[PDB]
Amino acid sequence: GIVEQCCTSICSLYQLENYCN
Amino acid sequence: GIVEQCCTSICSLYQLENYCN
Amino acid sequence: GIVEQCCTSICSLYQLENYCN
Amino acid sequence: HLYPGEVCPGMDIRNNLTRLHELENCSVIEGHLQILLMFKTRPEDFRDLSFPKLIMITDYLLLFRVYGLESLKDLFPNLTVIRGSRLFFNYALVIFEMVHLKELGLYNLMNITRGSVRIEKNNELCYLATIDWSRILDSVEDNYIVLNKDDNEECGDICPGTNCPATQFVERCWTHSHCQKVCPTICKSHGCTAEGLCCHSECLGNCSQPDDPTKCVACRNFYLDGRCVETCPPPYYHFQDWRCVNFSFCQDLHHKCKCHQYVIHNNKCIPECPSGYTMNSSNLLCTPCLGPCPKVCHLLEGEKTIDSVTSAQELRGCTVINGSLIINIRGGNNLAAELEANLGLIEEISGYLKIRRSYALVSLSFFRKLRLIRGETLEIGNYSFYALDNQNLRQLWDWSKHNLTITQGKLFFHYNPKLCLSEIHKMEEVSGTKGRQERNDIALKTNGDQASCENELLKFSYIRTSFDKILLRWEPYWPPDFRDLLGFMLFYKEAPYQNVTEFDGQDACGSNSWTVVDIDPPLRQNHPGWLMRGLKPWTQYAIFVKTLVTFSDERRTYGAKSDIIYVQTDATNPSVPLDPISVSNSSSQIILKWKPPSDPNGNITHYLVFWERQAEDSELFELDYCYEDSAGECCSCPKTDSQILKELEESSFRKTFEDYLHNVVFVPRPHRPFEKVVNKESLVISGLRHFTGYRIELQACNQDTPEERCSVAAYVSARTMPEAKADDIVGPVTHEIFENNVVHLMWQEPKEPNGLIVLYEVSYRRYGDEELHLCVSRKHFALERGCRLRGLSPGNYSVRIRATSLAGNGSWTEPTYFYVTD
Amino acid sequence: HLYPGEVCPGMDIRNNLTRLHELENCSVIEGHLQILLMFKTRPEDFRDLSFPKLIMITDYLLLFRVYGLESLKDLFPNLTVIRGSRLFFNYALVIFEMVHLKELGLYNLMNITRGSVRIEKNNELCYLATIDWSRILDSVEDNYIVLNKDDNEECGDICPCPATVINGQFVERCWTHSHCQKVCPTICKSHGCTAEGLCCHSECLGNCSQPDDPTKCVACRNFYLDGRCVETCPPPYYHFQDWRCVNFSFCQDLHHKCKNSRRQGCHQYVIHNNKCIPECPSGYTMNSSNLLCTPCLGPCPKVCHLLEGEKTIDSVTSAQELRGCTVINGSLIINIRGGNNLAAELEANLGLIEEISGYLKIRRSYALVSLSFFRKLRLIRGETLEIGNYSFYALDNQNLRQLWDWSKHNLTITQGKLFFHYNPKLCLSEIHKMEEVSGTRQERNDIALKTNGDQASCENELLKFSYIRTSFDKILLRWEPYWPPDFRDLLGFMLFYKEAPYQNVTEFDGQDACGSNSWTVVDIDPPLRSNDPKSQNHPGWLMRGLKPWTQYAIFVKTLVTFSDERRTYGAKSDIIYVQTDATNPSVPLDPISVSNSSSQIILKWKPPSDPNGNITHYLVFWERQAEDSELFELDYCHRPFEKVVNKESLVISGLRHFTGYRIELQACNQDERCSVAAYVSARTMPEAKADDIVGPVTHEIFENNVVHLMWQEPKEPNGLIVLYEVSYRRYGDEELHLCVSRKHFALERGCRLRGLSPGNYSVRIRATSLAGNGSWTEPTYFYVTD
Amino acid sequence: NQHLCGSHLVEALYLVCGERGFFYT
Amino acid sequence: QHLCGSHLVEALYLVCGERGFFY
Amino acid sequence: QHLCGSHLVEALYLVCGERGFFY
């Protein structure tokens, strides 16, 4: 899920703000 | 008509009340 | 010479037309 | 020799052979010399022709497309030195596309003060593998001999004797009947006589007597009235640093060519003024300058139209143009680079400028030195500049890194719908066309149509720097109508200097040096931002942001475009030291040489190197012998017009449907030894055992005082050679004969290790008979502490013992004499 | 009976959910339907409400910004057919801003004839890829689904289902976890099928109750009557809404009720072509004394007055409102963004128009490639004027290539002017043609001759090369001179050439010269003459940018400027594919020959670096090399050839196990023209079984205690033998060794030992070749004499 | 500047009315 | 190009470091 | 492009043919 959108692709700043406490 | 009376400026309160009855 | 005239400031087709008799 | 002939200005002899022989009487061919376009001559009209008078060429030796010539010894064999302040294609001996040429003549060519030797596109040229171009020139990297028939081994070469001096290749000879005299290496700069001795310290090249510059031709010192004179008595000027010619004669040669007119520079009558000089018009002295300075440029008919990168390579070495120019270049990739190279030095345009039908230009950065326009040529209508058919032009040169002033004419900008009127107003005053009180003819109804340059700035709320990532944030910007916001365009580039702006790089079709990322609009609040995808640590980058909005029927933008900032990545651990290379140069010393870290990420305070002793292997003792962006993968890739067109059309469509719907729905009411080096790339280990391996490591540390952060330790193994000082067998060769006639031997092993003694060879000789060899294995040696012979015959025997270490064979022991009895 | 319920008009229900009851007593709802503005309901207010009667809706349906709708199973799930008689932005259904909807509840609707669906700002809805729109709708080139959470995975869309793969998805097809997708025969999707999954009668549409039964069908494809889906109805009944027929009783009743003014907003229901409809078409006139569309004296028009005197069309919805209109008393403006082609639907709805009171303005065109959707308009009175006195307006048009045909259609503008700017897809030819047809008296017309026609081309004159000459990389050509009547406007020519072996080439027409496709431009200077037979008649030019053995598409265009001549567009050459000739085959690459065995050599290489010319046979010569005489002074005491054709490896035969070999490789391109050969050498590995001491060891035991030995040389020397190892041995002592080099060997015809003692002796002899060694001779016994 | 349109206008309108019903055709 | 593994963790930290983050 | 050396003779000889020859 998380790696599917950022490891094989590029993630935006708002994409990396949905996996934080 | 709600976009032809106020879309380029702020919309007066009466204009808003107009689309209520 | 011809090498100093065309190897720099290259000569167009009309220039080469002057040559050959 | 001597020069008894006249001095003649250079002659461009082409298409005939009458002007050539004219140089037979002339001894000094002052100026250029071109030998080309001879296809009427045959190789049967020459049998060896030499000219006594001609001894020197003074600008360049040019040979291009010469037919009917078998060797270079048919014109004159007395060429000694080729020097001057002028050069043809940066070569002193030009041999290009010659036919029937099979040998090179001359017997006096031994030194070239300045120049090179080009030998290209030959088809029969031989005799270039017998003589080396090392003592025939004063340069060892200016010899280009390619595309011949003697490089593939097809050309044969024969020289007198196996004679020709020497202190298919046999000897040092030019032709089969002309030897090449190599000068002894005791002088190294004065050539030598045919006899073979080096000339004095004042002579150069071929001489006629050793240590006698009086009879010398072509000397470092000057020549006058028949001898090499160290000084030139005024007004005599230093003509090519080889002779003296009074001021009168110098200016006479100068005026005669009005052929590389000769001027005065540093008391020398040289026809070339080095870079950074200007014509002092009192004696036409080449006076020095700072940076480029004015110089005439003879444009064809006072005009040079440029419409291609090739058509612009003729403006180099030019500071003040003679006439006007025209620009029509279209297409091309990374045009600004070649433009700034070819003509960046042009400081003044004497005439007008034309930008008619110009294409592939987005910003003008081609000129940095241009500061004044004389305007001697003006387009009818009192105009000093024209611009037209430019629909990609966004901005002109920067106005705080450049200066320009005009003295006449009116500006002209027509059919430029992409250049906003702001730049036009700027140039109205800066151009110096509105400081004269004269109305210029500029069109503002055909310029700026469906385009603008109205933009605002963005303020970065937060910035988080790392050594491999740079996070950025900024205030939430919104156009008058929030729905117009389409996102942001983060533009970034690597700035090595703090002068990186949108005017550097790109500005032309096919090239762009600013990478681009995109950001979605913020919530309708959170600050819009972006985080890098990885970057080089300790690197400075230029960044800025731009806004995208929905354009109206007039294409008026309401976006904001922040200014360029510079953010450097944070310091990280030092990189691994590239190429650790240690070389054992003795039995106790080793020298190391390496390259610094691939990325310093700071400053290397010191290098840390460890080493430990590696003992000798055991098996040895047991074995006896007795465009400018990334395009290989795109996950975010550059944008094109179609993308913008489509996204804007879809945005507009969505908004139309939305407003339609809303209006329908709402209507109003009804340890280990070590060493350290600081700022050094070499280490020397002192005091190491011979033939002993050492595992040396190499590190680097960008920071040493705050923390001991260092790079990975690169390893290398160095096995020193074994000593070769004491290989001989030591101690007396004790021979003990017993009742059984057994001659037991007690010899001592060499004291110095010298590696290890793999064996001990013995060579004895029976008087009056053949010798005998025997190998004593280490095992048997230790068993007997020497050897032991069983079966000796009466008579005396001579014995020699040679140890064998890893340092090669030793030296045979002297013959021991023992008379074996029966 | 197929419709046991009632019929309902088109209502809008907002601010209250207690009006849905009025729709449960009617299984048909004429006109559109609307549901929106529900900001007081909660999920429970919907799941507890089920609707039992709905068969088909004549128009579209609106669902907007509603709370509490979890699925469409609380609505009427028995809907089977949607027609879309009235469009809403060219959409038959819309979904927008749903916060509680997570699934679909319509399991029986499988046919849409008009209209598409818009989906946006719906981040709580999934299952939007299992519908198989292709099978549901009749057109799938207008479905718009953007700005939704379903662009990524939201709910997985799992539904344990047929999972048919038609659109190209192997995901289960369904509408609700427990409600799979309805599947029926492909030839039973236009005649309707049964809920079971079996075919049905060919006179129905959608669902059915029994296979192949027309008296119980749910929906009717053409008409409904007497409890059966009919396709034609007796004349007592008249077609209406095209889904059933109604007897003349109710038609006349409606007509009369509308005639009387107690009800407003209606038209009289006259009977035209056996149909009772509210309006009449051109050529006929409504008379309320007959209840029909009575004939007219000549073609009778319909004066359609526009409210506010202007109506901008951006959808067919606004056009359909003008069906049967001939006179427009107002002005018109049109803009189009995205979407698909509409000219068909446009002409079908407004072609009847023949006159317009105002002007016509078009702007930001992005979906129409022409304006040929009006074929009855022939007169533009232009009564209402513009600012500047124009009677037409073309603003920022980037899709218009031609205005109208000028052979089968005409258009005359009585008064006004014309505007033409920022249209780079429409050249000046169309403008000129139209102006001449309209007879625009000349009129002041502002026309742009530098911004219009920049991305399109109307150049019809042609250029043709006359002289052609190519040898290997040069192309000299000459073409027929073409110059405008004014020989001072000529700006030369543009020779466009590129490397293209494939022939799919498209000539330059305005496209950018900075993208991924480039056309090498060659600017030829302008001769500026009326043709003089003194400096050649056909302009000539040579090209030297080409490379040997390469094909190039080439053509040229004429550059000119015109602000006076209006029919001058230059001339251009035709596309040609000129392949350049090559020279030699090029130098071969990687000539590396390595010995595999000790008698064979393997030669490996790569073809020429340049692909110039046709690759052909390869010729390789070889010759032997032998050791120099210097080796015999050391001691430690024509030519055969082979040819391959287009191969990468060669096996050399005719060798041995020593001596180096000279090897060369040369390629040719003709079976004639060749190139310089490469150079390489290699040595076969040595065989140490042919260097062993052979022949008997002949002993000469003299009474002098001098043994003269004579051994024979090996059967084949590898290069040479610098020396021989002879290790003899006296019983009782270690083995002794003696080196016998070439000198002593030849001298004594083998060896000679002096100083021996009585007793038998054993000797060994080994050879020493350049590589490897021989073998130690066995110990022979020789008793030295005393 | 900011202008009340689209969803912004809808939200900036629901507080004015929408608990007494909206405009009716 | 892409950020994965260690890079992804460091990035989640650089973006969320005032409220912590879960990998 | 540029006529220098080989290319000069090549272009001159190949353009000629409607005239004699002169280099």
Short mmCIF file of N, CA, C and O in Angstrom, two decimals, chain D residues 246-292:
data_model
loop_
_atom_site.label_atom_id
_atom_site.label_comp_id
_atom_site.label_asym_id
_atom_site.label_seq_id
_atom_site.Cartn_x
_atom_site.Cartn_y
_atom_site.Cartn_z
N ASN D 246 65.50 47.89 -38.49
CA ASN D 246 65.23 49.24 -38.02
C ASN D 246 63.77 49.62 -38.20
O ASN D 246 63.07 49.13 -39.09
N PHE D 247 63.31 50.51 -37.31
CA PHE D 247 61.94 51.02 -37.29
C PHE D 247 61.43 51.36 -38.69
O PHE D 247 60.30 51.00 -39.05
N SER D 248 62.24 52.07 -39.46
CA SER D 248 61.88 52.44 -40.83
C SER D 248 61.44 51.22 -41.63
O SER D 248 60.33 51.18 -42.18
N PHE D 249 62.31 50.21 -41.71
CA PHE D 249 62.00 48.99 -42.45
C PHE D 249 60.75 48.31 -41.90
O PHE D 249 59.94 47.77 -42.66
N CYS D 250 60.56 48.34 -40.57
CA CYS D 250 59.39 47.71 -39.97
C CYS D 250 58.11 48.37 -40.46
O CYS D 250 57.19 47.69 -40.94
N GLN D 251 58.03 49.70 -40.37
CA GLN D 251 56.83 50.38 -40.85
C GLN D 251 56.70 50.29 -42.36
O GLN D 251 55.58 50.35 -42.88
N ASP D 252 57.81 50.09 -43.08
CA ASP D 252 57.71 49.94 -44.53
C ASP D 252 57.05 48.61 -44.86
O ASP D 252 56.17 48.55 -45.72
N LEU D 253 57.45 47.55 -44.16
CA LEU D 253 56.80 46.25 -44.36
C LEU D 253 55.33 46.35 -43.99
O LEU D 253 54.46 45.85 -44.72
N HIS D 254 55.04 47.00 -42.86
CA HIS D 254 53.66 47.21 -42.41
C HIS D 254 52.81 47.83 -43.52
O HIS D 254 51.77 47.29 -43.90
N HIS D 255 53.25 48.99 -44.03
CA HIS D 255 52.51 49.69 -45.07
C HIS D 255 52.44 48.90 -46.37
O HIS D 255 51.43 48.99 -47.08
N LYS D 256 53.49 48.14 -46.71
CA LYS D 256 53.48 47.38 -47.96
C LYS D 256 52.34 46.37 -47.99
O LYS D 256 51.67 46.22 -49.02
N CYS D 257 52.10 45.66 -46.89
CA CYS D 257 51.02 44.69 -46.86
C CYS D 257 49.64 45.33 -46.96
O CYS D 257 48.68 44.64 -47.30
N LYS D 258 49.53 46.62 -46.67
CA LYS D 258 48.24 47.30 -46.75
C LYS D 258 47.84 47.55 -48.20
O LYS D 258 46.68 47.81 -48.50
N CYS D 259 49.08 41.37 -45.96
CA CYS D 259 49.89 40.18 -45.72
C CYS D 259 50.53 40.13 -44.34
O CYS D 259 51.75 40.08 -44.21
N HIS D 260 49.69 40.12 -43.30
CA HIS D 260 50.16 40.07 -41.92
C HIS D 260 51.09 41.25 -41.62
O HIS D 260 52.27 41.05 -41.34
N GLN D 261 50.54 42.46 -41.69
CA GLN D 261 51.32 43.67 -41.43
C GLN D 261 52.08 43.55 -40.11
O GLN D 261 51.55 43.07 -39.11
N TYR D 262 53.34 43.98 -40.14
CA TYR D 262 54.24 43.89 -38.99
C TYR D 262 54.16 45.13 -38.12
O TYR D 262 54.24 46.26 -38.62
N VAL D 263 54.01 44.92 -36.81
CA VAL D 263 53.93 46.04 -35.87
C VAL D 263 55.01 45.93 -34.80
O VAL D 263 55.79 44.97 -34.77
N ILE D 264 55.06 46.92 -33.92
CA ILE D 264 56.03 47.01 -32.84
C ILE D 264 55.40 46.53 -31.54
O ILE D 264 54.37 47.06 -31.11
N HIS D 265 56.02 45.54 -30.90
CA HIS D 265 55.53 45.03 -29.63
C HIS D 265 56.72 44.51 -28.84
O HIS D 265 57.42 43.60 -29.31
N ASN D 266 56.93 45.06 -27.65
CA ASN D 266 58.05 44.68 -26.79
C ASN D 266 59.38 44.78 -27.53
O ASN D 266 60.25 43.91 -27.41
N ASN D 267 59.53 45.85 -28.32
CA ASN D 267 60.71 46.16 -29.13
C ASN D 267 60.87 45.19 -30.30
O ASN D 267 61.88 45.26 -31.01
N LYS D 268 59.92 44.29 -30.52
CA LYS D 268 59.98 43.29 -31.58
C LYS D 268 59.06 43.66 -32.73
O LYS D 268 57.88 43.99 -32.52
N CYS D 269 59.60 43.61 -33.95
CA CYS D 269 58.84 43.88 -35.17
C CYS D 269 58.04 42.63 -35.51
O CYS D 269 58.33 41.95 -36.50
N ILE D 270 57.05 42.31 -34.69
CA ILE D 270 56.22 41.12 -34.87
C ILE D 270 54.90 41.54 -35.50
O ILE D 270 54.34 42.58 -35.11
N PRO D 271 54.37 40.79 -36.47
CA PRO D 271 53.12 41.18 -37.12
C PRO D 271 51.86 40.82 -36.35
O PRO D 271 50.76 41.17 -36.81
N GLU D 272 51.96 40.16 -35.20
CA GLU D 272 50.80 39.80 -34.41
C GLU D 272 50.88 40.41 -33.02
O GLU D 272 51.93 40.39 -32.37
N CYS D 273 49.75 40.94 -32.56
CA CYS D 273 49.65 41.53 -31.24
C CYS D 273 48.91 40.50 -30.39
O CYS D 273 47.76 40.16 -30.72
N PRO D 274 49.51 39.96 -29.33
CA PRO D 274 48.83 38.95 -28.52
C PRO D 274 47.50 39.44 -27.96
O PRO D 274 47.15 40.62 -28.04
N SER D 275 46.75 38.50 -27.40
CA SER D 275 45.44 38.80 -26.84
C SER D 275 45.55 39.86 -25.75
O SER D 275 46.46 39.82 -24.92
N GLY D 276 44.62 40.81 -25.76
CA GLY D 276 44.64 41.88 -24.78
C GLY D 276 45.48 43.07 -25.17
O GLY D 276 46.00 43.76 -24.28
N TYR D 277 45.65 43.33 -26.46
CA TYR D 277 46.45 44.46 -26.93
C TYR D 277 45.62 45.34 -27.87
O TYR D 277 44.60 44.92 -28.42
N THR D 278 46.10 46.57 -28.04
CA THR D 278 45.43 47.59 -28.85
C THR D 278 46.48 48.39 -29.60
O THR D 278 47.63 48.52 -29.17
N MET D 279 46.08 48.91 -30.76
CA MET D 279 46.98 49.65 -31.65
C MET D 279 47.33 51.07 -31.23
O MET D 279 46.68 52.01 -31.69
N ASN D 280 48.35 51.26 -30.39
CA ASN D 280 48.78 52.61 -30.05
C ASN D 280 49.22 53.28 -31.34
O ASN D 280 50.21 52.85 -31.96
N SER D 281 48.49 54.31 -31.76
CA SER D 281 48.81 54.96 -33.03
C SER D 281 49.81 56.10 -32.90
O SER D 281 49.50 57.25 -33.19
N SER D 282 51.03 55.77 -32.49
CA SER D 282 52.09 56.76 -32.46
C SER D 282 53.22 56.14 -33.26
O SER D 282 53.92 56.80 -34.04
N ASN D 283 53.38 54.83 -33.04
CA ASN D 283 54.32 53.94 -33.71
C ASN D 283 53.61 52.61 -33.95
O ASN D 283 54.25 51.61 -34.30
N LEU D 284 52.29 52.59 -33.75
CA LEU D 284 51.46 51.39 -33.89
C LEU D 284 51.90 50.30 -32.91
O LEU D 284 51.92 49.11 -33.24
N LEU D 285 52.25 50.71 -31.69
CA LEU D 285 52.70 49.81 -30.64
C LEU D 285 51.57 48.95 -30.07
O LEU D 285 50.50 49.47 -29.74
N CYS D 286 51.79 47.64 -29.96
CA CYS D 286 50.75 46.81 -29.39
C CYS D 286 50.74 47.08 -27.89
O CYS D 286 51.52 46.48 -27.14
N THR D 287 49.88 48.00 -27.43
CA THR D 287 49.92 48.21 -25.99
C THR D 287 48.94 47.27 -25.29
O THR D 287 47.87 46.99 -25.81
N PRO D 288 49.30 46.76 -24.11
CA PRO D 288 48.41 45.83 -23.40
C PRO D 288 47.09 46.47 -23.00
O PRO D 288 46.94 47.69 -22.94
N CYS D 289 46.11 45.60 -22.73
CA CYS D 289 44.77 46.00 -22.32
C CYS D 289 44.33 45.11 -21.17
O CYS D 289 45.03 44.17 -20.78
N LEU D 290 43.15 45.40 -20.65
CA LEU D 290 42.53 44.59 -19.61
C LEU D 290 41.30 43.98 -20.27
O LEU D 290 40.42 44.72 -20.73
N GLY D 291 41.24 42.66 -20.33
CA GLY D 291 40.13 42.02 -21.00
C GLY D 291 40.21 42.34 -22.48
O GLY D 291 41.14 43.02 -22.93
N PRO D 292 39.25 41.88 -23.27
CA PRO D 292 39.27 42.20 -24.70
C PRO D 292 39.18 43.71 -24.91
O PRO D 292 38.58 44.43 -24.10
#
